[PDB]
Symmetry: C3
Subunit: 238 residues, 3 copies
């Protein structure tokens, strides 16, 4: 089929990179479909969350590449579900996701330097910001590949599950996110984006300006009510 | 008694959030007493360190909230001693502390988004700066609660101790801090605050300007002397 | 011999701090030789990597101190190989290295505050950027010493090896770095340096400007060829 598969399942959009005979290596068609999917995530108020995964037991001016989430980030949470090889492109795009599940046999690495290529997916910026400095330097400069266990130990992913279970676990996480207040979830995400690189005192001013509107919503009344009643809240995104 | 308890024990001020019938939920009185305590920490040269804890087996424009250490940070080190539930407010204020002890059964989490509320204690700014990016996103966007062990594994706290021992461990740490050179301890803390969000080359200029005065002190002579004599230094904060 | 030893071994320069009767405590001569070595690393195109180690079973305006890599960073990767005590100066200079191997019995710590001294090697800036915030605060403010295992757990070093093996492991890592494309390795390193303290969207513009030239090189053609042929690439630094 198409080089990326796209399915809406309730409030979650699932995007599957889909060239399994080529280890889901990126194609022009794949990237075009991915950008259309990002647009749908950002613009459809019924979408509360997105999952990025790969088919067939694999995962996967040029300063802005929308498909690869470099210079663009989704306005709703993005969960990665990684099976198998995620070297090169896969580890780069992983860094543009927010919450991260790896199957036991998944493999990560940025090996561009081994072949005297430069990583075009933004790893030289992001990796030192997401895992400890020295480990990020080791991975980028040696091109060492790592296991899912090692990736979890260093904080590159948050969850490790048995092989074949990454997408199931990601769907569990998405169900939780979809059940949380979309106005609050999306406001938190915007603060995380906007306050990068600032002293915290400057950041708090933006944090408050972003967050205050959440309390005006019908959802901000229903939430505490549902909590008191020990039931699932019924949020309406307003 | 008062909604926050305050005791000076040698060079350490101990602040205990104290509404144990309400899981030490914040009150106006609690916050007023906390701000008075922060003032005392900053202004009393005899105070070298502060501990924030909760009673009864629990822990706990709006861009600046002094009581919650958002837009204000103590000029002397602040050690958290966390027993039991520290969800919501407790996990937020935890991020304004410097050194962190959790009892085995302590529980952390920022669950505001579950109820379509926004976290008003600055977590959307700080958490991604204090634990790995992906884990911070997971906690804030799902509202997942975590154990003390998990909190230690991700770097949210530094020490885990048996239940009922968090304050004892914190007092041990405070004794060490109180025995170190207050001029040096406080200078280090100021550099950490002031250099946030700068390239390191700009930061080193501030680091040196802050640190140089420490060497002019009587304490900077007594320290190396005491080291050579294998005795506890007698620092005078000058 | 000289207070720092310097050897070129193929594409790797090895710098050994060498006052083993004084636990490799820094001297004027040691620092002078170190700066000459940094110059050689930066300026000799045949050098692809550097190792900093200590002899004899030990490791080791003032806003810029070249010898201690404060306000200056090497243009090629720097790997630390730490045997034994690395307290004070050793832990500070460690933070200016990129990839880090510790022997089992190595000890780290910044104990200046214990003696009412200020750390002049830039730790008050860097440590909170390299390990989790709360752990960095604990180490700097208490002066607690840590084991190699603890250093690995917190992300201060990347590798732990048996005693006497730190330099051997570092040479293994250097062989890998030396075999990678120097143009790509060095470009990645420059992006990591230049993009510190910026929002990622500003950083990507610099990342791309730095990286694009790598693809014009003869090395960028030989790399993928060698990969396809399952052989070691023969890079020429052009």
């Amino acid at each position: 089929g198409p080089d990326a598969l796209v399915e809406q399942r309730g409030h979650t959009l699932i995007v599957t990179m889909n060239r399994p005979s080529r280890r889901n290596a990126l194609s022009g068609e794949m990237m075009q479909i991915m950008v259309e999917a990002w647009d749908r995530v950002d613009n459809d108020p019924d979408i509360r969350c997105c999952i990025l995964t790969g088919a067939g037991g694999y995962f996967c001016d040029p300063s802005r590449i929308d498909a690869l989430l470099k210079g663009r980030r989704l306005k709703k949470p993005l969960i990665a579900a990684v099976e198998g090889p995620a070297i090169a492109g896969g580890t780069e795009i992983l860094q543009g996701t927010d919450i991260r599940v790896a199957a036991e046999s998944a493999k990560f690495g940025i090996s561009e330097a081994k072949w005297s290529l430069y990583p075009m997916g933004g790893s030289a910026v992001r990796l030192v910001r997401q895992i400890p400095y020295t480990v990020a330097c080791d991975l980028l400069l040696t091109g060492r590949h790592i296991t899912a266990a090692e990736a979890k130990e260093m904080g590159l992913v948050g969850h490790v599950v048995p092989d074949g279970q990454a997408l199931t676990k990601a769907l569990e996480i998405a169900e939780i996110i979809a059940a949380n207040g979309p106005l609050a979830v999306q406001a938190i995400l915007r603060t995380i984006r906007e306050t990068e690189g600032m002293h915290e005192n400057e950041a708090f001013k933006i944090d408050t300006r972003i967050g205050i509107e959440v309390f005006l919503s019908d959802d901000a009344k229903e939430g505490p009510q549902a909590f008191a009643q020990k039931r699932k809240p019924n949020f309406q995104n307003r």
